[PDB]
Amino acid sequence: CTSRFWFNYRHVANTLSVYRSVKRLGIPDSHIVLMLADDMACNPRNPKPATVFSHKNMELNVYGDDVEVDYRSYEVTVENFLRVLTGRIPPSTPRSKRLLSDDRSNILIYMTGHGGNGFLKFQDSEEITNIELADAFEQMWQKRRYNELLFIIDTCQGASMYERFYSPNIMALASSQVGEDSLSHQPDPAIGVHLMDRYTFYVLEFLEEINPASQTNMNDLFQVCPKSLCVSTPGHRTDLFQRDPKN
Amino acid sequence: MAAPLVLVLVVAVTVRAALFRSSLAEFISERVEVVSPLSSWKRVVEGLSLLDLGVSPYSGAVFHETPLIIYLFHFLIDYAELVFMITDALTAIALYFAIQDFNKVVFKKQKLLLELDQYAPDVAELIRTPMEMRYIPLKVALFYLLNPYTILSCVAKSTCAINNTLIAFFILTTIKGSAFLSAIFLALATYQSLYPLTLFVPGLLYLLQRQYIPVKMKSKAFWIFSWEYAMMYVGSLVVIICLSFFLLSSWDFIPAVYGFILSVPDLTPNIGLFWYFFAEMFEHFSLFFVCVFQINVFFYTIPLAIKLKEHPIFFMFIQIAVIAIFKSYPTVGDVALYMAFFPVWNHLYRFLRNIFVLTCIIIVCSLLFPVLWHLWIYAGSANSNFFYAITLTFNVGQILLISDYFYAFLRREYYLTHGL
Amino acid sequence: VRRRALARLVLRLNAPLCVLSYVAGIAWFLALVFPPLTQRTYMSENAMGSTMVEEQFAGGDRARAFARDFAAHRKKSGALPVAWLERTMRSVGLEVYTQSFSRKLPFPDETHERYMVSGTNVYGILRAPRAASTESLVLTVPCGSDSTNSQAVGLLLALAAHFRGQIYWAKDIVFLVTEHDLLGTEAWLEAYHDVNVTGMQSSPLQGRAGAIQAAVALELSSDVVTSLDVAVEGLNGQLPNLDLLNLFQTFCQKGGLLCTLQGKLQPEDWTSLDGPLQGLQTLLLMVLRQASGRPHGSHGLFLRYRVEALTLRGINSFRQYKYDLVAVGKALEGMFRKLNHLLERLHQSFFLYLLPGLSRFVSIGLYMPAVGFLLLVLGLKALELWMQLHELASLVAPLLISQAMGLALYVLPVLGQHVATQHFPVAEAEAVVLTLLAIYAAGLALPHNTHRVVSTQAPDRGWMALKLVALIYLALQLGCIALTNFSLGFLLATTMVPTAALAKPHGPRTLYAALLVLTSPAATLLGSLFLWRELQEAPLSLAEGWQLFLAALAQGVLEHHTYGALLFPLLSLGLYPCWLLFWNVLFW
Amino acid sequence: EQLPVAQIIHQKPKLKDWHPPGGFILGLWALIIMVFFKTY
Amino acid sequence: RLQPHLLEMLIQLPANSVTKVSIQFERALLKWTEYTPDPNHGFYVSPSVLSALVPSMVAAKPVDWEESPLFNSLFPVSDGSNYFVRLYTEPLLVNLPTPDFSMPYNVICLTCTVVAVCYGSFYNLLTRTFH
Amino acid sequence: AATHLEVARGKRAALFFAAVAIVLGLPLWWKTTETYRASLPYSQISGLN
Amino acid sequence: SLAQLLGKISNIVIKDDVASEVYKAVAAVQKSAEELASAHLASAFVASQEAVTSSELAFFDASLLHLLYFPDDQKFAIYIPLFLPMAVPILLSLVK
Ligand SMILES: CCCCCCOC[C@H](COP(=O)(O)Oc1c(O)c(O)c(O)c(O)c1OC(=O)CCCCCC)OC(=O)CCCCC
Ligand SMILES: *[C@@H]1O[C@H](CO)[C@@H](O[C@@H]2O[C@H](CO)[C@@H](O[C@@H]3O[C@H](CO)[C@@H](O)[C@H](O)[C@@H]3O)[C@H](O)[C@H]2NC(C)=O)[C@H](O)[C@H]1NC(C)=O
Numbered sequence A: 001c002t003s004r005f006w007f008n009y010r011h012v013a014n015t016l017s018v019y020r021s022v023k024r025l026g027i028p029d030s031h032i033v034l035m036l037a038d039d040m041a042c043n044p045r046n047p048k049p050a051t052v053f054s055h056k057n058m059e060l061n062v063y064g065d066d067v068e069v070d071y072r073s074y075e076v077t078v079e080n081f082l083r084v085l086t087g088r089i090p091p092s093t094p095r096s097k098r099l100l101s102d103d104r105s106n107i108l109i110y111m112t113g114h115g116g117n118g119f120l121k122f123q124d125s126e127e128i129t130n131i132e133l134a135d136a137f138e139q140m141w142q143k144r145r146y147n148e149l150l151f152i153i154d155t156c157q158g159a160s161m162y163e164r165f166y167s168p169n170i171m172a173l174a175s176s177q178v179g180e181d182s183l184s185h186q187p188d189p190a191i192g193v194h195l196m197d198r199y200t201f202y203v204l205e206f207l208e209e210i211n212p213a214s215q216t217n218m219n220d221l222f223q224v225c226p227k228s229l230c231v232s233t234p235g236h237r238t239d240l241f242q243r244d245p246k247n
Numbered sequence B: 001m002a003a004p005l006v007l008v009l010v011v012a013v014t015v016r017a018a019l020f021r022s023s024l025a026e027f028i029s030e031r032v033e034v035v036s037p038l039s040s041w042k043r044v045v046e047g048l049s050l051l052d053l054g055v056s057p058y059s060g061a062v063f064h065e066t067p068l069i070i071y072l073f074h075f076l077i078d079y080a081e082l083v084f085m086i087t088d089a090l091t092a093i094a095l096y097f098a099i100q101d102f103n104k105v106v107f108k109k110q111k112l113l114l115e116l117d118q119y120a121p122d123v124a125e126l127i128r129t130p131m132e133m134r135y136i137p138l139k140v141a142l143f144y145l146l147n148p149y150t151i152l153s154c155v156a157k158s159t160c161a162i163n164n165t166l167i168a169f170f171i172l173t174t175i176k177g178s179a180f181l182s183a184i185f186l187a188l189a190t191y192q193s194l195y196p197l198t199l200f201v202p203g204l205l206y207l208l209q210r211q212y213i214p215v216k217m218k219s220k221a222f223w224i225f226s227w228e229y230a231m232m233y234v235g236s237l238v239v240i241i242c243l244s245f246f247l248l249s250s251w252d253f254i255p256a257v258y259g260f261i262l263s264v265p266d267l268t269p270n271i272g273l274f275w276y277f278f279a280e281m282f283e284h285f286s287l288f289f290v291c292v293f294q295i296n297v298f299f300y301t302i303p304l305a306i307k308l309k310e311h312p313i314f315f316m317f318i319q320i321a322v323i324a325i326f327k328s329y330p331t332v333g334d335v336a337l338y339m340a341f342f343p344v345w346n347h348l349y350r351f352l353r354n355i356f357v358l359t360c361i362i363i364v365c366s367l368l369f370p371v372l373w374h375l376w377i378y379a380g381s382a383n384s385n386f387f388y389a390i391t392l393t394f395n396v397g398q399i400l401l402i403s404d405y406f407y408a409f410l411r412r413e414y415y416l417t418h419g420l
Numbered sequence C: 001v002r003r004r005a006l007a008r009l010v011l012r013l014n015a016p017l018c019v020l021s022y023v024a025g026i027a028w029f030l031a032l033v034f035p036p037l038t039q040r041t042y043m044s045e046n047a048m049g050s051t052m053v054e055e056q057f058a059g060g061d062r063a064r065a066f067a068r069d070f071a072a073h074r075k076k077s078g079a080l081p082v083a084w085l086e087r088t089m090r091s092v093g094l095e096v097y098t099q100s101f102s103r104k105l106p107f108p109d110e111t112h113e114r115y116m117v118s119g120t121n122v123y124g125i126l127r128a129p130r131a132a133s134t135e136s137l138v139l140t141v142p143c144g145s146d147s148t149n150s151q152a153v154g155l156l157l158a159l160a161a162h163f164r165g166q167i168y169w170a171k172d173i174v175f176l177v178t179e180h181d182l183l184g185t186e187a188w189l190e191a192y193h194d195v196n197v198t199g200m201q202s203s204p205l206q207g208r209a210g211a212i213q214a215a216v217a218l219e220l221s222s223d224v225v226t227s228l229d230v231a232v233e234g235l236n237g238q239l240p241n242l243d244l245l246n247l248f249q250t251f252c253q254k255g256g257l258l259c260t261l262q263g264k265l266q267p268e269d270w271t272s273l274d275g276p277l278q279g280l281q282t283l284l285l286m287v288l289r290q291a292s293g294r295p296h297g298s299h300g301l302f303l304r305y306r307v308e309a310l311t312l313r314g315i316n317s318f319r320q321y322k323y324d325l326v327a328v329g330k331a332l333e334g335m336f337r338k339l340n341h342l343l344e345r346l347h348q349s350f351f352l353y354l355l356p357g358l359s360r361f362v363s364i365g366l367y368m369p370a371v372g373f374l375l376l377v378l379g380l381k382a383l384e385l386w387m388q389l390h391e392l393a394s395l396v397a398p399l400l401i402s403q404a405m406g407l408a409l410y411v412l413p414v415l416g417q418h419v420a421t422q423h424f425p426v427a428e429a430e431a432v433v434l435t436l437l438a439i440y441a442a443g444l445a446l447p448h449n450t451h452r453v454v455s456t457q458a459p460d461r462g463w464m465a466l467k468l469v470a471l472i473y474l475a476l477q478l479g480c481i482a483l484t485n486f487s488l489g490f491l492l493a494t495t496m497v498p499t500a501a502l503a504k505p506h507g508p509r510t511l512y513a514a515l516l517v518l519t520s521p522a523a524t525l526l527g528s529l530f531l532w533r534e535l536q537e538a539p540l541s542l543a544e545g546w547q548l549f550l551a552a553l554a555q556g557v558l559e560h561h562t563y564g565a566l567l568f569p570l571l572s573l574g575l576y577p578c579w580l581l582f583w584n585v586l587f588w
Numbered sequence D: 001e002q003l004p005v006a007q008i009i010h011q012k013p014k015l016k017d018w019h020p021p022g023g024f025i026l027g028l029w030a031l032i033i034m035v036f037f038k039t040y
Numbered sequence E: 001r002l003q004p005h006l007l008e009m010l011i012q013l014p015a016n017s018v019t020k021v022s023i024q025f026e027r028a029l030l031k032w033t034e035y036t037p038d039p040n041h042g043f044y045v046s047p048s049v050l051s052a053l054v055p056s057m058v059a060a061k062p063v064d065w066e067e068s069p070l071f072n073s074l075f076p077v078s079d080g081s082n083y084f085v086r087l088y089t090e091p092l093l094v095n096l097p098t099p100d101f102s103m104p105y106n107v108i109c110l111t112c113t114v115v116a117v118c119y120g121s122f123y124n125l126l127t128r129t130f131h
Numbered sequence F: 001a002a003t004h005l006e007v008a009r010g011k012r013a014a015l016f017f018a019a020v021a022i023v024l025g026l027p028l029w030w031k032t033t034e035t036y037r038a039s040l041p042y043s044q045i046s047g048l049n
Numbered sequence G: 001s002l003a004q005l006l007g008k009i010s011n012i013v014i015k016d017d018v019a020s021e022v023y024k025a026v027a028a029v030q031k032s033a034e035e036l037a038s039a040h041l042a043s044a045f046v047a048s049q050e051a052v053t054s055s056e057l058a059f060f061d062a063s064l065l066h067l068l069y070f071p072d073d074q075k076f077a078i079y080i081p082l083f084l085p086m087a088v089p090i091l092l093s094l095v096k
């Protein structure tokens, strides 16, 4: 989550919804490198401390009682992110703050925040571009640090963040296409700021209905958000995956 | 030793004492244009207090004065206002007598050149004349004392006043021809502010011009005197450096003073070109600009020497101006030292291209510095860009003023040779 | 060849270029009420523009009960009920502190009959539970020595009762009830930052709330209210960040409140017949109020401490539709709840604006030419005076005296009040104002004693140098003033610049004297008082106009001494000597 | 001991007013006189 | 950038009284790449530590850390008539002057342009011969 | 005479500007801006493929 | 991978530690390959371990991230303001 300032509560909620689904489906905390550029979970402005909500009904706290943030506040930088992906972190970094993936590792990477054309703003200050992201993914593939990689981005014009990928096994999702930038705004009266980005909200709803022993496939998640529901057109990308998404 | 210079001195000390005892003294001392990290009374007192606590004054980022300053204000900590009055009076006296002797030498050279008639016939109101040079030393002392820059520097109790006194005594001793005292005062000034080293080139030249030693390659006497003066200067510098070591028994003043002057780590706003440039600078690619901006101060010394070989006092004035404008952490009292030399070159007030607009720009910038400083430090109405723009305009005005004076001097020399 | 060509083409147009520049500046100022320059106001800061507030303040009846109790105890306790305020603030769960302050006014002020001001400020601190008490917001009611603002104290206590009990406070809320209208606010603000800017004595504060971010100065002396009157103009012409006023306007729109700036309304400025007129009228009112430089309300004292402050004055007119505490209480709660979202000191929007109608504004880069052309008039006069001077001791004599006169006008009126009262049967404040006016006229009627020395015959050249110096000085300080506060610089350059440009002894030399005297800073203040009273549809005759001029001089001196208002020193030390220099230029 | 008041006062050498060493004063004062004799 | 100020003082608090220890500081201007992503929020001065042996109303007994409840064995009591307390003051929000983060490239051009106008003026005077 | 002397001085100053701006101007750019690269075996590493 | 990374982007400061590790890794790879073709499995395994440690210390070094260095294209745009003063000596050495 590359966003601060408590009015970007939607981005923290996106990240924590993906985190809740992933941790419910099996991935341990040690294998999740969670980054929240601001808590917005129990900062003083929160009307409900220690909770992050997905819906106005306030019945599903994506910031549950079992959550670990490996990188938070000023630690969540484009530098630190690329360090985690490429493995070039400082040597004192612990296990929990690094991606110790191998050739047999499936990696899910979910990026959320303000994002323009082929670039993602990190805490309103710095920038990660699709060129740098593709280069980092290639560097990961050179060392065989992932078996298959699923990239999901939930920013504006997010289909261009995965437009410069060349590493062999990556399939990518995106909330919006190259052009659409209209950013939704419907602040909850109870929680002052916006709740979600409406794309990961339906991804969360899609992922809430499956169990760990579920046979749902990527083809059932390639149409989780239709044009009727999220104003933007969520575009995927399978030009690299060898395996058929339906399997 | 003058009838009206004493009156000038009493008026200056009266003004300075009134300001010291007024309620504006604290405001002036906290002014950032008149006070730098190198010339702050608050920082001198802080270093003394650190010594009282037993911690070294240079084991921190707040004290950057020299051990001679430490020693001097250890004893004169209570009489500081009187000491600063005395040092500005000494600067005025040194400038007065230096300019008096320099005018006498200039008239002597003009007479010895009119005798052999190296001037064109169309030169009548273009030769320096004794009635117009009678009050030039008095006007020099008057510009040095009764201008707001020096008054503010004194009231703020900045050590830039001490630096000015050292440089003025260097000028006086060089003009009187005392090579040894010239070297001592040049070494003291270089030890204090690190940018009178360039002034080594003019003084020597004038010294040679006073000894009638030709300045040329195939001249043994020129090399002998140059080596003698250079050895006196470097030996004085190294002796002062070793003595300053012995004051604290440690070489900590060396980094904290000279590397602080050269590397610029403070970024405190000034009237100079360094603070904002190095605050908003890219991390890599920044050492190159430190290097070039420090080379800037020393860059023109050799070309101005080989263009102003026969005019080492105008060359000294231009060098002092270049130091004052391009300098890590310059106070406005450094501007006063070269502005006091204007009456020496007021006979060029017929070739000055644009003096009115430049004086207006400098005055407006001087009176806008506190105003915009208030508007982005105490009032949130403005930002650092306002102060940066005023610093840019002030420094451009200084450059164009100095270039106008230099152009006028060269044009007057050309008209002395060729008829107008 | 080229230099003479340019010189002849510019002196051929001395008078027409100067008058064209002056009229251009006036026209640019008049054009600051039109859409291209006054586009619209907006919330630049997303920290509170991208959020919403669902107000739940429903304690208006408690506010009324608190107002009744406060009025009763304030009738019993003559000045301010301190024990009752402490009990009530500790009942709503605040940390209650009092500050005793006292001040020696220079003279009895002839307005509140107060000479030895002494009172207590009572403030309570809402301690942000989840925060570490590092930032704070101030809700202040400036109680005076009369029956007003008893409802505002009740509303403040009712809001404190509501805010206490909420976990969503990132900043402490300070509920401050000052003793006097502005002296108490100044005392509290000085002791809070522990500075002594105005030399006022007080007791040490037993409790602070951290760096103050924003401040609200609710004045409300009626139960129901017809319209809500915001005021954003601070001491020395300073203004709050525009986002605070945008926040107020958006919470007026959301709650249906009929909110007004300086008592004026515009549904939409685009009416093409009167919208420009109402915009011009309200912008003129803002300019006259900002040039005044006094702290209209307690919000004006916070701006010196880099605190964005705003006064809301509930006014109960003859409009039959009324809003109770709930509308105003909900507006205040929403404002504070949305300032709580700031999480960063207001650094966006604008700090230097000049806004016509609470929804329109002009940036500094947009209204700067209005005074820039007026300064260009002086610049052209100086340039052509210099080039006529080119094609001394006689300047030292005026300058010094002029500056001396300024220093005479700054210190003597207030310290010589005792001898003026022992001489003439006038009040101490009248003694101060009489001394000020007498010294003004003494500087006026003194061109001859200084002319006891004659070192030039039919001079007409040292004359030019004196006028050149005066023009440069006037342009410089008018530009500086316009940078600090535009309105004062503009108002001074509309009157002094045209007369300063034309001051030669070659003309009538009697019409010129009348022009300079009628555009002197004192005459500028008198005309500004007349225009300000006219702009409120309350015309004033010469008698009570002169009485108001007396009151304005006395208030200028007093406000300078009590809040550090930079208008008495500015007129008396920097502008009066320059205008006297022009006077000497006239009578050479 | 959480606050050993007696021990922590004596752990620091006594705060004495600083003065320049006799070596510097003698060294500086000797050479100030020395320059007074080359010129005089 | 390498070490903070540390100040440790043993102040004898006299009686029922308020001791006002104050120290003046001057705010520094930092590099543009030295402020937090929220530069206008400010910087935090760490809460100051206040270690004292406050006198006790009634003298305590020497009690072993096993029989005693867990809240009575945090600090190793030494005297008995005085109990050790370690207070922490509030963190302080101090704002620093800030450079304009949006103008790092224009500043280089403008300052180098001032250097360049000086260089050009001195070039066109030290090399150009009058004619 | 004097004109020749001033022309020679101006040419010397221009020479000094050129000489400095090259000999110390370009090595400064080189030494204080270049990314420092140590010697890596680029033939052995390729041979290990 | 390291060679390709350093050849692709020419703004990475590779320092003496990285070069030392690369040299150690290459030497150890050659030694282990020449010892595997012998009755020297133990020495070959130790050399392979040394080679892996050196090569992964060189590859995963904090200083190889291309964000620590100013972009090369913009390095020739932050110098034009110094081209303007430096364009005068180079041109006036040729015109005269
Ligand atoms: C040498 C003289 C002038 C030097 C530069 C002037 O311009 C700099 C300042 C702007 O003051 P500011 O900080 O209010 O405005 C801004 C922001 O607040 C902000 O947040 C931004 O992101 C901005 O970009 C921004 O404007 C800018 O970047 C400025 C762009 C101009 C560059 C020219 C090549 O001018 C003046 O005020 C002084 C008036 C000058 C004369 C006394
Ligand atoms: C800000 O500065 C002013 C002075 O410029 C301070 O006012 C001074 O306050 C003290 C009280 O602490 C006054 O002393 C008192 O005098 C009376 C009568 O002489 C005496 O009976 C009292 O025991 C006490 O000593 C002093 O007169 C007064 N000065 C002036 C000029 O009025 C003010 O206290 C400062 N602000 C703060 C917050 O301290």
Ligand SMILES: [Ca+2]
Pocket: A029, A030, A031, A032, A033, A034, A068, A069, A070, A096, A097
């Ligand atoms: Ca983890």
